[PDB]
Amino acid sequence: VSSLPEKDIQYQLHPYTNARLHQELGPLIIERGEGIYVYDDQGKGYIEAMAGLWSAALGFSNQRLIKAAEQQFNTLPFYHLFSHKSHRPSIELAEKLIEMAPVPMSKVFFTNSGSEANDTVVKMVWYLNNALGKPAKKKFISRVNGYHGITVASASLTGLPGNQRGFDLPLPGFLHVGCPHHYRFALAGESEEHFADRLAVELEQKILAEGPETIAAFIGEPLMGAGGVIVPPRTYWEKIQKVCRKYDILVIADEVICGFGRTGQMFGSQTFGIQPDIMVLSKQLSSSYQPIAAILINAPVFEGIADQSQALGALGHGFTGSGHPVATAVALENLKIIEEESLVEHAAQMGQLLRSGLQHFIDHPLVGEIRGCGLIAAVELVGDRVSKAPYQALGTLGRYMAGRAQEHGMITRAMGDAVAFCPPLIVNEQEVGMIVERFARALDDTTQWVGP
Amino acid sequence: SSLPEKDIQYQLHPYTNARLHQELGPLIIERGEGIYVYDDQGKGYIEAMAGLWSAALGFSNQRLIKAAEQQFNTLPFYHLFSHKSHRPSIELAEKLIEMAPVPMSKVFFTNSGSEANDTVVKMVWYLNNALGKPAKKKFISRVNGYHGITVASASLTGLPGNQRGFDLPLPGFLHVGCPHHYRFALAGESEEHFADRLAVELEQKILAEGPETIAAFIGEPLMGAGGVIVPPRTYWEKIQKVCRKYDILVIADEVICGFGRTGQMFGSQTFGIQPDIMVLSKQLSSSYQPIAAILINAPVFEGIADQSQALGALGHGFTGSGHPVATAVALENLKIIEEESLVEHAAQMGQLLRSGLQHFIDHPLVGEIRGCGLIAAVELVGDRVSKAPYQALGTLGRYMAGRAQEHGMITRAMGDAVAFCPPLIVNEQEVGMIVERFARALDDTTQWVGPGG
């Protein structure tokens, strides 16, 4: 048998893993990928219904991206953007991002990860408000169950307890308002629109209690990804933005998951009617073939930063890999493919098929909710549909269900007791059918396990 | 070319004055080969910084490029979350642990050095909570140290340029003195006594803050971006004794020093550091891919592991953590460094570099020549007795770096010092050319100043 599992146990500390259990069980070693599939070291194939980490838009064997990497490696395999240095793929990618943006944007700043990007945005907003002579205007508002990454600062923006417990987070000045999840937080008989009203009132009261002059920015994923595929209620973003504009608070759209065709349009900001001052992009940006993220800032944000960078000598910020030529070349080619192959439209089509397939299970006794938009969805299981209570404890069903899905050849992700769907954009109709079938088998297993 | 206008229109550059950039536009680098890069006008430059202290194998290593291809065609993306794994992360982690200069237990991967140090902060907090020491959370670092630029890692960083305007450092991130004898020793003080004073400073800081509140001390073995600052003799010995006395972790930031930069495989070896945690990046992959790695020792792992069990899972990880292409490239890169004996070769080339620069040791504008292995700096001054700058601090360094570029060499000014950090594969003739181009830039600067005397 392969030496790899023992070596993995001996030498790797895994993210998002119980380290002690890992020492007992060892890894599931993924050996290779092609199309929407990955294969373990025993040769078993799985539909990667998460596209890896919400990210492999073009699947696991796109030869154009691979050749784009090769072409750039053979030209200039590393360079940087520090001190006026530049290079073609960062320039052409920045051009393309600005010109495809759903609202007018001024500049792009590159990082490696979504976490670094949001961390950078925090720093940029502080820097901006200092430049503007508003030293108190520094607080960020985000939402319960939001996920913005896991640096010290971005984990503070994040609203999931799993990212904060044990880590002494959030830092001060990172405030949280309600998760816009109607199923869990609406009143009995309350409409989506009235639920949205109540959330907007909550935001305004929070701004008032803190002192509006101390609030710099509001950040949100158009729909929440890692926190549960939570679609906000109708009118939420309209009403929330009105509150933000009233108090001169920046609106930051975290498009790390929603970006590049996930939600039925190119950006989640389009789908949900968001006019952000700043956008954060990653993941599908490069089909995760290279680590890269991008921040788009509008004109007022750029102008204030630019002014301060002059007064303070240079902008004292940047990663070694910021705009890495291979990562930018791969992302550029990736965006071209998404456009040329009409994958936004195709994904929207496939998403309707996914959602209608799943909706066959709406009356199942363990299905509490089916939600989603475009080609992202979740099914939330419960132990009792009237009370919405979990079986045993929150997470017990989702853990079992995700494990059963894997046994039936599908990789999903449990988010508490919901299981997620975020397949590659290139998924076809029968493959959507198979995703639903493998969900159904896992659901059948879970039902028998829970028992009468 | 349409590129310069497009760059000015669309890119906010790191470590650049944005207004000046709108006036001047970029220097567009088009291609690279060996130790050279070429701009879009065809002019060639020796990349005496190896890009960003990082391109160990130069700019056209075909083995790294083919290693990337082979992995892209196997599995171009996967992750390490929830027990998932893959061969290149496993084999890289094995190699890193087995090559470590002290016994290490586990590797955690990130994309950047900044993310890695940020992660270390979180790991240390998480550890001390697991151990039932909730107060033991403060970090101590040094003036002019550079640890990256996330909110937390910029707090560790001790360069004002990284903090002014950004409301940093955060509370709980404390700084002690820059160990640079030339600038901070008392008149007539020995290196060893300077080291004694720095150790006393650290101990007094630990005492004033409450030792029970201090979790960790972090330092680059020699400081890179902050000036190629070699610590005085006996510094690391004495500093570590203080840390051990109070049960404070010792974290070696090897982002620049790692993989043969300093004359041995690690800066920790060169300077006699026994770190609890090491942070690696840059030469790890010759920067062909964004990757960094954290090595943690047994006690650090065991505490983290215990808490990750009690709390369900370790709530930390980047999408790109252990990225299969980045890890495959890094693994091949380390194999090349070993197979081609590049640690030894770089040590040899570094002696040539230093002896070449030392022909200018009595020049009226040369204040100090420092370094070790294949990293060095020449610090220029306007007056050697007072060590004062010519005009404003930074004038000489800026002028020198601009002249070096005109003579076909990319160097980095750090105030009035110019840095050297060439690819490890640099050969003897190429070291000769680096020093020649330094000399021409120095001649130009000297003529520009007119020292007289």
Side-chain angles (χ1 to χ4, degrees), chain A residues 3-218:
Chain A
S3 68
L4 288 185
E6 184 50 58
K7 289 176 184 206
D8 178 78
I9 289 168
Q10 191 59 48
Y11 303 121
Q12 297 212 89
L13 175 63
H14 279 259
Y16 290 113
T17 302
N18 172 340
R20 294 303 192 199
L21 181 57
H22 189 74
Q23 292 181 297
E24 186 201 343
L25 300 181
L28 179 67
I29 293 172
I30 301 303
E31 178 179 299
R32 52 188 176 91
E34 117 268 300
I36 70 171
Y37 297 87
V38 298
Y39 302 78
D40 67 25
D41 64 351
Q42 314 300 299
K44 178 168 165 81
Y46 309 82
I47 292 167
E48 236 299 349
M50 298 301 300
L53 292 180
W54 323 83
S55 58
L58 297 185
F60 295 92
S61 56
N62 185 281
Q63 187 57 207
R64 280 178 72 168
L65 297 191
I66 297 170
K67 295 289 180 36
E70 177 184 90
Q71 174 158 120
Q72 187 58 45
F73 273 130
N74 282 316
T75 305
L76 181 63
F78 172 71
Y79 213 66
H80 60 90
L81 299 183
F82 293 21
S83 311
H84 310 279
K85 297 294 194 298
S86 202
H87 55 76
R88 175 182 296 278
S90 67
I91 295 165
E92 294 186 353
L93 179 57
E95 172 181 46
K96 187 171 196 77
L97 289 169
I98 292 298
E99 300 294 349
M100 77 194 281
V103 296
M105 288 290 184
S106 174
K107 300 290 171 286
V108 182
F109 193 93
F110 290 117
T111 68
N112 307 291
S113 64
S115 293
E116 285 168 346
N118 284 320
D119 195 289
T120 299
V121 168
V122 170
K123 292 182 71 187
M124 286 177 166
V125 169
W126 295 346
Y127 194 84
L128 173 60
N129 283 316
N130 285 328
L132 297 178
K134 301 174 186 160
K137 191 173 181 71
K138 302 294 168 62
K139 298 169 183 167
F140 271 70
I141 300 178
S142 59
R143 286 104 40 105
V144 168
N145 296 337
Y147 185 84
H148 297 297
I150 42 64
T151 62
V152 171
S154 57
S156 297
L157 291 170
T158 291
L160 290 164
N163 296 118
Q164 301 182 329
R165 188 173 172 212
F167 290 112
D168 297 348
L169 299 179
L171 294 175
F174 294 84
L175 310 175
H176 298 78
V177 293
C179 176
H181 189 190
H182 185 276
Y183 181 70
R184 293 298 190 183
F185 301 104
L187 309 174
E190 185 182 33
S191 64
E192 284 199 6
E193 289 82 4
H194 288 160
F195 180 43
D197 292 339
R198 205 148 56 74
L199 292 159
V201 169
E202 184 202 6
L203 175 61
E204 181 157 26
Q205 292 304 309
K206 171 58 76 164
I207 291 160
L208 289 168
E210 292 287 330
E213 78 287 352
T214 70
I215 310 304
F218 178 88

Side-chain angles (χ1 to χ4, degrees), chain B residues 34-36 46-51 53-59 61 64 99 255-266 281-288 333-353 372-376 420-431 434:
Chain B
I35 69 171
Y36 297 88
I46 292 167
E47 236 299 349
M49 298 300 301
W53 321 84
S54 56
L57 297 186
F59 294 92
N61 186 280
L64 299 190
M99 77 192 289
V255 164
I256 287 168
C257 292
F259 309 107
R261 183 50 56 185
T262 70
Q264 300 186 45
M265 185 66 76
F266 301 100
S281 191
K282 286 182 184 296
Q283 297 203 127
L284 178 56
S285 66
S286 287
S287 285
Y288 279 39
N333 183 76
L334 300 184
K335 289 179 184 170
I336 296 158
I337 287 172
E338 290 174 340
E339 292 168 25
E340 304 293 347
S341 302
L342 289 171
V343 173
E344 174 57 24
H345 176 76
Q348 291 298 356
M349 299 302 97
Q351 194 37 254
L352 293 171
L353 174 62
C372 78
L374 198 54
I375 198 168
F420 300 87
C421 189
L424 305 183
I425 59 156
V426 72
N427 70 32
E428 173 167 12
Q429 178 180 51
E430 289 166 339
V431 171
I434 288 167

Side-chain angles (χ1 to χ4, degrees), chain A residues 38 51-53 55-56 60 287-289, chain B residues 75-79 319-320 323-325:
Chain A
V38 298
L53 292 180
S55 58
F60 295 92
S287 288
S288 51
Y289 278 38
Chain B
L75 181 64
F77 173 71
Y78 213 66
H79 62 89
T319 294
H323 192 288
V325 184

Side-chain angles (χ1 to χ4, degrees), chain A residues 86 91-92 94-95 106-107, chain B residues 1-11 13 21-26 28 40:
Chain A
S86 202
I91 295 165
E92 294 186 353
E95 172 181 46
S106 174
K107 300 290 171 286
Chain B
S1 179
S2 68
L3 289 187
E5 288 159 46
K6 289 176 186 330
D7 179 78
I8 289 168
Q9 190 59 47
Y10 303 121
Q11 296 215 91
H13 278 257
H21 191 71
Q22 294 181 297
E23 186 200 342
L24 300 182
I28 294 172
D40 67 349

